[PDB]
Structure 1
Amino acid sequence: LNSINTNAGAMIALQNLNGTNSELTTVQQRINTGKKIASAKDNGAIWATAKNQS
């Protein structure tokens, strides 16, 4: 396959790159807020429990 109209390897590379970008974003959010569960998106049950305790 030497097609000039598509590039599946580029798609796989972009998928891996987007996964790495998401990992870096979540890690920098943990570094910035100082919390591994800063919102209900992180983990709803433990987040709500912690809000009640606080």
Structure 2
Amino acid sequence: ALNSINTNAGAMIALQNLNGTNSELTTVQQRINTGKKIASAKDNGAIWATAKNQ
């Protein structure tokens, strides 16, 4: 309503973008800790299985 005192979409959208950035930071920190792109089976299943077998 642009004057509503019960809600505001700006805060929700700002929250969503902040959480997106936090998830990206999680991924990069994982990449740094392990030293490789595909560490677990969640990153990429096909390539992970291939590397294990190889």
TM-score (structure 1 length as normaliser): 0.94
Number of corresponding residues: 53
Instruction: Give the share of equivalent positions with the same residue, in percent.
Output: 100
Shift, 1:47, TM fit: 0.5
RMSD: 0.5
Runs of 4+ aligned structure 1 residues displaced above 4 Å come to none
Deviations 1:10-53 (A, max 9, x none): 00000000000000010000000001100110000001001100
Unaligned ranges ≥5, structure 1: none
Q: Residues of 2 paired with 1:8 and 1:40: CA distance? A: 37
